[model samples]
Target: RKYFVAANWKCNGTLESIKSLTNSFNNLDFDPSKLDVVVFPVSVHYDHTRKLLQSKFSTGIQNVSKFGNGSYTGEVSAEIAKDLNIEYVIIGHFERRKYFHETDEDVREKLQASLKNNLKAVVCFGESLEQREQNKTIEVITKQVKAFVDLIDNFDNVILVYEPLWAIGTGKTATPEQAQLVHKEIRKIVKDTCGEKQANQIRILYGGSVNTENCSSLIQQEDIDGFLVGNASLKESFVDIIKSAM
Candidate 1:
């Protein structure tokens, strides 16, 4: 399986910034087959950002609306994403859970919508500081994983991202060992709940204040296929992160 590096650009980006960032990303040299690099621009800038990017690089949306396409105002649905040829969708990030109050049921619908429309899903699961401090990392993430895991018999286009809440935006990182411990457990959970084939076939990505310096360290871990980078993704450092997976 190829290593995966996804840049979740999140809600930050002006048109000028997108132009500069996209230009920087397009100059990167790497084998796309060996490493899957996906850039997730906020939905608004998707078309504009993609215009400057080479076809070798895939693009993604930050979140999909739980509702397919309807009277749901100000929402972008999976159907619309597919129509735009968007390749990936990030669901269940803590930002969605905390700010938008995305529930398990909400994420379930979003995943089903993503799968139904044939968009590759970068499904995110994470544990709170309290949960981790209480030694409930696996326990907490299991609940997050189950929202859509059991509903799907085919996980061909699904990629799981494990982002620990405390580590994200807090300038903290799970040491490589700590990151693998959770990545390993995620696969175990997929094996027990899904199947060995599904477990082996799926790629699990680590996300938590991942920067150019620490990026190389995590990709070497057996279970860490790659990263779902945040802040670093907005800079030229993103080129380094993608190259690290190579």
Candidate 2:
């Protein structure tokens, strides 16, 4: 697979600001063939961003509605996202799980919804700092992955991102060794759940304060397929990070 670089713009940028960012992106000297670059701008920018990015790269919904296609006031469902021809949707990001009270069951529902919508799902799983401290990190990750996949068997439509809760946006990165162990374990879980062929096809990414300085080492590891960059992705830091894998 080519190197993937997914940018989570989060709640950043107004439409005007996005236009400027897009203009800057348009001027950049980057290799589209070698990098599967994506930007998850705020939902407000989706309609506009999707139209602007069609010729350049793929796009995704940073947040999808837990409520289905109904009268839910402020929710955007996978069906709606797919209607926009959204190719991917990110589920179980750290903040979403923490602040929104999103349980494992909710993630499972979102996963199924993405599948139903025929949209690729980027399912994120990792442990909190406390869990890591207590030596229960692996166990917590194992449970999270198992819970999401227990009712689903298809693997090609999904991607896994291993962003340890302790590291996200905190500037504290996992040692390359630390990331390797978790990534390997994630593959093992996939292999156990499905099979070796599916496991090899799965893209497992390592994320958490993944800036330019540290991204190269992480990408060099065989198990780390790509990234889901948070803070560093909104600026030139992303260009530098992209260069590392290329």
Candidate 3:
């Protein structure tokens, strides 16, 4: 399986900052064959990032509209993402759910839109610390996967990222065992619901509090293919994470 390390720049970088960072990243000696990295810079910076790093690595938008066309202001359509040659588009990010009030149905629509447009999607799912405490971690994740499978029905190009709400940007990393348990459970769900072929082909990534220090053991886990990095992705720490996988 190919490893993908997708960086969610969020709202962090300015034009000049992205330029410098992309320059350094373009010059990095990391191997792209083993690591197919993609940078999801803020939407405005997508073009700038593409100019600098498109040939060396893949790039994408953070979110796109669920509908195909018309009447949705401030929403980028899946067709637009495809036109831009975006290899992947992220749907159902936690912030999109928290701040934007995107429901699972909205995510389902986006998944369908992506499938219709032939764009790859990395649909994110996670539960809060409270949910984990209630032993609802698997419950929440399983529900999300079930919804995805029901909505798209047979989405072959979809990738899944299991990100726990509490760990994101809190600097509280998930232990390797903690992550593997979830990965295994999610894979079992895939196998049971979709079949062994889909389960075996799917690349499940662990995200949240991922940094240079904690990446190795996380990646060493049986099901972790790579990461969906956040804050640490903006600095030199990210290079260390890349090298760790290498």
Candidate 4:
């Protein structure tokens, strides 16, 4: 599988900031043939970013509605996203689950919507700080992965991102070994549930506190296919992180 480095800008970035950032991105010296790069900005900037970035790289939305079109109030449906030619949709991000009380069932519905609309889904799953402290990381991750494994008929287009809550934006990070162990277990779960063929095809990424310095080591781990960057993605160092993936 090709390595994929996705920038999850989260709630950050203004139009002015994006203009400068995209200008910098347009000048990055990396071959697109070497790896895949995608940016997931807040929903408001999807159209403009898609236009600005043009064919330079792919773009994804931060979230998608579980329900289809019509009277969903403030939700953006997968159909609308696909209509704009958004290449990917990130679902089940920890922030959405934590702040919005999104359940596994909710993620399942959104995944279905994304697939039905022909959009690739970058599904996020991970353990909370408390769960990790209690040594229930695998149990929690298994449940989350199983939710999708049992629901989907195919895994060909899904990208799995593991973002440990304890490490995200907290200035703390999982050691390379720790991240690899978790990634290995996540792949094993897929191998068992969806079969070895599907498991090997899926690209499992590590997110949370990923930066230029730490990213090199993180990407070196055998099971770490790529990254889902947060803060660092907003700056020039994000180019360093992308190069390190090579």
Q: TM-scores of the models, in the given order?
A: 0.95, 0.92, 0.94, 0.95
Put down candidate 1 lDDT per residue, 49-81, tens digits, no spaces.
889889879889898888878999999988998
Candidate 3: stretches off by over 4 Å:
150-156, 169-173
lDDT, candidate 3, equals: 0.83
lDDT scores in order: 0.86, 0.81, 0.83, 0.87
Q: Residues 45-122, candidate 3, lDDT per residue (tens digit)?
A: 888889988476778889989887789888899998888787789999999999999988898989989988988888
Report the lDDT tens digits of candidate 2 across residue range 1-246. Answer: 566778889888887777766766666677677677778888878889876654566789887876689889999998888888888889988788888888888888888888887888888879988788899987998899988876455665688899888765556767988898899989998888888888888788886678878888899988998899988877755667877877
- The TM-score that candidate 1 achieves is 0.95
lDDT score for candidate 2 against the true structure: 0.81
| Tens-digit lDDT track of model 4 for 35-106 | 889999888887778778847588898999999999989999999988888889899988899899999999
Judging by lDDT against the true structure, name the best candidate.
Answer: 4
For model 2, the stretches where C-alpha displacement exceeds 4 angstroms are 28-34, 151-154, 169-172
TM-score of 3: 0.94
RMSD of each: 1.4, 2.0, 1.8, 1.5
| Residue 150 local lDDT, model 2 | 60
